[PDB]
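@channel anyone free to eyeball this complex?
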Amino acid sequence: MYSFPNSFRFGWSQAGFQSEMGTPGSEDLNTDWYKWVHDPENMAAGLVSGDLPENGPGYWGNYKTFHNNAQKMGLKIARLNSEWSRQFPNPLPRPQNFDESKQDVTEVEINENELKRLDEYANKDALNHYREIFKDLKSRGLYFIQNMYHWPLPLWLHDPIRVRRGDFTGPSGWLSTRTVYEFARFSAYTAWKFDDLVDEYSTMNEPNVVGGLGYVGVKSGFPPGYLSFELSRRAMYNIIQAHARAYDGIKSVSKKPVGIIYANSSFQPLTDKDMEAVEMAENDNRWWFFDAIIRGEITRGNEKIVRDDLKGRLDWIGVNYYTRTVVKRTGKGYVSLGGYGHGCERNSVSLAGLPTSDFGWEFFPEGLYDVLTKYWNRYHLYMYVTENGIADDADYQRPYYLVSHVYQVHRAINSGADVRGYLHWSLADNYEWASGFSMRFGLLKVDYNTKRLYWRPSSLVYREIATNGAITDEIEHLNSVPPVKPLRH
Amino acid sequence: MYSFPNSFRFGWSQAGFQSEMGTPGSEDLNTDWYKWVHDPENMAAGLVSGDLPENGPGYWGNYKTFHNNAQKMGLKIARLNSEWSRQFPNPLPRPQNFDESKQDVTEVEINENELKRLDEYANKDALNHYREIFKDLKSRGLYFIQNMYHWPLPLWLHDPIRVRRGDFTGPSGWLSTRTVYEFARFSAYTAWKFDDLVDEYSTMNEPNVVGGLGYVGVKSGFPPGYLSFELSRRAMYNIIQAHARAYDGIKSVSKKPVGIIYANSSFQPLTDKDMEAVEMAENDNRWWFFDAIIRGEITRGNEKIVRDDLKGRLDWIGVNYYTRTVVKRTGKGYVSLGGYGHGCERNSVSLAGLPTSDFGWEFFPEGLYDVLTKYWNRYHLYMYVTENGIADDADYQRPYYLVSHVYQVHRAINSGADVRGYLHWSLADNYEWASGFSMRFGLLKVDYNTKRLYWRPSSLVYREIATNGAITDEIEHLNSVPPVKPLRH
Amino acid sequence: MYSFPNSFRFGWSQAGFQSEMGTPGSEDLNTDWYKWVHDPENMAAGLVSGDLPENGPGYWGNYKTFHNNAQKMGLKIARLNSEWSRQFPNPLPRPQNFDESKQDVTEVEINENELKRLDEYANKDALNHYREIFKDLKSRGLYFIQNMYHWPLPLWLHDPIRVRRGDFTGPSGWLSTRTVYEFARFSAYTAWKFDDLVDEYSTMNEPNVVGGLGYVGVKSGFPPGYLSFELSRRAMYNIIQAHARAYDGIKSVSKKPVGIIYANSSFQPLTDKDMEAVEMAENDNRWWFFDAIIRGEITRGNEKIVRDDLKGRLDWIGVNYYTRTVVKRTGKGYVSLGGYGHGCERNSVSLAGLPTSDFGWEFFPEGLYDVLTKYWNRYHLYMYVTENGIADDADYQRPYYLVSHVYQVHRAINSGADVRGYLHWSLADNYEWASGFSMRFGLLKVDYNTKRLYWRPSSLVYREIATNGAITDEIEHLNSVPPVKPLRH
Amino acid sequence: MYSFPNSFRFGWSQAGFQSEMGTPGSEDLNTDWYKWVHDPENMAAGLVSGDLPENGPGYWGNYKTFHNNAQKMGLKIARLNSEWSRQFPNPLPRPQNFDESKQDVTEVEINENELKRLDEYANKDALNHYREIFKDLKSRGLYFIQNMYHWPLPLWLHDPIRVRRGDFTGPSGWLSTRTVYEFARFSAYTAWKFDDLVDEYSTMNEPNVVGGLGYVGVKSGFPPGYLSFELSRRAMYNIIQAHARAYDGIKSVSKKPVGIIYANSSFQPLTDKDMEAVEMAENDNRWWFFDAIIRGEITRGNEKIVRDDLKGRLDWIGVNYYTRTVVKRTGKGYVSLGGYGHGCERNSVSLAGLPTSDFGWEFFPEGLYDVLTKYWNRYHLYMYVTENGIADDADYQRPYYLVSHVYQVHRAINSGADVRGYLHWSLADNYEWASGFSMRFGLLKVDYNTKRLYWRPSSLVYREIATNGAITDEIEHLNSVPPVKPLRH
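replying in thread with the prediction:
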């Protein structure tokens, strides 16, 4: 049988922007993302689906129903985030004792007096409502991982349209150290007010996707959608500093563990002679970032420095895994291959013959074992599988996907990796950014009209796993690939 | 919400030949079906799959595991049958006072003395084992419907190969009134020995398929596989008498309800101008048979008669429903159309765009409401949905199929139809006659190697229904058609 | 480039029963096949499609249109057959000096006097019409291969329904040596009257399918449809004698070449360790038959004899190839595998990923090279590819199928095999026996309403090949597998 | 039968950038498009396929082979374009007495002296080579339509990367009246040097796609890929002036007809109550542009004006049609619907059940009739179907697509529309802009390795049409929808 450690917890992850809106009074118009998906030109260009967040699941108002269902499903841990924009919707006076021309931000002064003054600008209603949501979460015995940032930035810090047009004279988001500075303070502020409810903290969610899709993969429809290798590096550099500064800010107010959540992929060799391509890919997509916030090894400009203000700023690693990424060696570097991992046809099969989701992502459980063990053997920091799921409205593949990946986590634990939990990507369907509501990742189906929640069969399977703290014998057969004969090719 | 009457029971149906064998010591070689699927010529011709019953689920030895799982699933009723061949594997002496040339069998003398003498020929081991299986079933609080016949006939009463070759000088099964005579006695015998364990009786299962596929739809690979419209009528005539005589035999020993289980289909009009074709189909496939055993109206030779010995021989009706049958008025009468109901492509879509099972059967829940109400408004006899299910190894459609048809039963009850239960076709996969083991109808998947049982997600859904005696709000969304976009076309 | 020998001819094959009827006055009701496809029970059982020959292409009346199109397509050879039933629709007096109980038919006396008397029973109208059709064929410069038999037998020699019912007291077709006797005389008669128009003769078409599907593969819907391994052997034994006797009969009246047309398949090993299974399959499906009519080695009863009256009765071999047959070694024998060759899903892909036709036959050109070379290396008799084609109404695969197989014939010639021609299976769509008109093999599409013919693109491709006597550079790319991405899976 | 007017010509269209390169010495690196598809960031973002023009069909060196094949196919007309960049690869001195700040360009002085001086900057080698290509075209009796511009702009007039980055201080292509000015001169220059070879002129190809995809549909990967409704209008305004000025320039040197080629779509109503949506779409996508260059009615800034310098600048209309565009009325205006026309899944079926191409475009022949008649009834200017084709490497649908649309042209002529020719989009496969070489529109398949050309079956069908100047009876059946059952869904 496949039983998990006694302290191991099964739960779910969720994002504010993707799930909060939907109920009357929940509208939040002050984020770059909100403006971004409402933009006429982005819609016309098809960069965004046309669906609007205002028509979401309504977690902001129906959180009790969400939590109650999670409880009935036997979940014991949850990771959510606070929307910076709801806390500080209005512009903060330009901070002094700060030079924006300075490339590095080695420290941000945070003390009670600063927090007290910052508190005067905060939206108490939003702050109080969050406390209510989290109190309900905790009163139900659920372990709580508080994440500080999940993509949207308050508009007074980033006007995505301005930047998309090539105008860099306004709020430029992660392109400005002003954002780094304010994020550190913001993180400290939240921890200062919610520490009594939080068990573990996370500074941000998938920072690599933010800078990657925002400035390079512009067809993905992510803000500011300005194509530039150089600005992408600047964004990633600043987000790395932001993390470190946020880590110190939180630690000034709390003793709780502080980690980060990253977007992962299992790099697989097309051929047995592509092993070196894998390592290269792992360095460019994984190691460089973590060696920076753990080893303090970073590269600003064209020199390989080691910043002490960055070294050791991490207590745990949040692993977000969905599928693999096949690569091939090409003289100089390497290349990712279409028809595998994230680059497949929707509701079809990959070049390898494995079923793909409604999003066109290939079914590849083993990849999760690879990533977990890889992270463990390199840094030996404990971790949580903070995200794992599948866009599958019909629920044809989710049962197999759920059981298979949970099994891989079990396998990684037996190899010695310290994995303390598994959080399925979402309890209920939500807003899939540029893709809209059509991509449904929930264990619970959402009727966007009534906002009513339904239990997909896989949620009943998950209840068995959470409830028994193991993959029971009766559902072991689901640790396999969804049969492709009955599915679309 | 969709709640069922307090006395309403949810369970499953199962056949001896399809599920019993598989464990050591369970072999039963004395049936026409056993010889039929082992026949070299039938295999060569592809009339039978090649799979053998001896390699089945092993219910004969693992019944306790079956029953325990049904209990855990919240099931409260079960319908099984005893294999005539196991009870009387050896030839019984030709009955005296019996004229096989006589066309009608208006009565069979059954009294304790006859039963006592019959008992001397019975296989006590098989009889005792059945009692153990049924005692275990009852000790678990499950209501029990005892069916007397489910297709296989003991070899001493029918050599299928002989008949298939055109030789009618040997045991000819339902072509001989000798079979009718012995069946009545057999039924009385079983009721005489198991009445203390039985709640309700059924004489036979799908007699229409036996005579229909056996003598007309010969490509189906059913014994004796001899093509003849005339012999098909003779077979159906005798099976009708057998039912009536078996009904009287059982009633001589019991006061319990005695019904019959029939293979049904919902006849749908291709066009709004095919209404008359539907009625014609219903008369030729349904009404003629039941008007015979209920109204006593039958037609022998070419004369329309009314036999008093046939009138009123039925207490309840067992409805076996899987899909619809579309018909059109044509040159002469009417015609069934391929590309609909049972005549579709496997793992595809029908001409109407509805998903088809691994068996090529079209998804059509409404048809069940049609059949139930049709039966009710004509005879007003209470009934059980004795069979409903789908060949779906992957379990992609079963969740939708299960909830949708259960909903239709609820809808029929609200129309006033007296339906007392729903028995899903099989708890676990089994031997699908000429098709072999490839067609898996179970809520539980069977590993034919280890004989181990696994819970498909739909069995977890069924547990919710059985346990709550209703389609709970959380799974209501399953009362819909399986999305076809992700499925094969 | 791929050019063929100067004397090599490109043309087509066609059958009387499949193409003749369709025009007024062409009805031929005196064959076992005609009665067979009109039989009410066969239709009800689904053994036959329900389509009727009377509604065919109408070659009997529109032959000139057929021939003219073949001419425009550059074809220079044609193989057709005369329908025995049209010549002798009425029963002939039983032979005086013939003992039907005798197992062997080592000789049939044929002399001018016999022919003169036989001629008195012949239908001169049918005979004269055939002469007109063939004269038109020859006047157009087309080489002519005259085939004597293509399945249907006159009713006075075979009542298929009687036999199907197990009654062997009437005309039993190939189960009677009377049929063998009459066939020899018939063949001699036709050669005696058409020798001036014929270039080369063929005794029969696919005798192996006749005996194989008629008495073993009964689900195929071929007469008499009586399942019996033993009677299948008797049928094949008699058909073998019939061939030999027909060969001698023709040779008594002609000096022209006399061969036979056989149904072939390329036996492929599932694994590299199934080589012995291939040889076994080749012996049971090919060699046994030809070693009989060439080497005179046959097996009657259970002894391996060598009949001198059978030895050397063959001048050339007609190869009918459509697809492969994958086999695996099992126990002491072997087994054909579904999902390959003829046993695939319609309009899909095989287990090997190769596209399948409207008939469910797998695309496998190489198999033709295998069969041609196999035959050559064993007997060294020259041959014609008398049949090759595909059921493809849309014409999506025919272009690739045509060019690919023609290429394989070129490849076999370069290996040294003496192949003198390629006859595509049919100029125009026709009646596919039990399958009806739905399976369209024509280069020309037939509108069964108007009987009008249309040129599918592949017929334009074929014109290039015939016209240039080679696969021109411009169409070489068609020597490949039809792309499967755009096709159905 | 469907015969065309005696003067009606069948041929093909082709673009320089898409077909010229491929042979050694044919490289043209001086265009915005060349730089655009070689850009590292565009490749990384996936805006461009990664395929490079340098690896094309090689028309620049193999034109004789192209022309010879067109001749063999019976084609009698061809429309090609000269690449501005090849003629004037180097920067021309700024125009004195020209004010770039001026919004309108009502006239450009063109006289022999100006042309003489311009000629000194021209690349004689390229000019001479073009003359050779065109002389070969004419010596084969092919009617010749000379198009002046087909998207790529010389780099000294447009640096797409600069603009994409938001920098508008450099060569801005159609955003600068300098480009308009130079285009008029360029057009006059070419006509001045090639008039003896030209039969009819076209100023530009699909100007609407240039401005539309270049500044609005940025996900299409077209230069400069800068999202801006406003700059899109400016670009279209300038391109409209450019046309008018080019028309006058050419007319100063020639008496030949001068038209324009536009990208068309047939706007279809989703419902019978969406008729007004169609008209609105037609105004926004068609009428506004043509009323400008024909009626002189244009709107600069926001002022609706009527410029006499624009009025009457058109002799004929080039219709480029591929598929429909379904629209629905929506309160204010209207909306195009995905799942129809250009917005479908690749190698699938549309929401209407019609087959889609390798490019995801829906099969809709009728739309061509709609567009032709619409244009005729409004302006009564004769036209040519300058483009019609399908991305179909396998050639499964092209035969039906070709015959069906040609039939629609015949139908439009019988309605009274003056259509003088049909030019299938490309003789051979070529570079599909941002999509690369994967989208193959050719009647002839190109092996990009050997640069060898192959005849797809549809080219044989086209030869029948061109050769007979009509859809012959034998191929009439192709005037239908490609069967979807065998195709992918």
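from a first look: The two ends of chain C are 34 Å apart (CA to CA).
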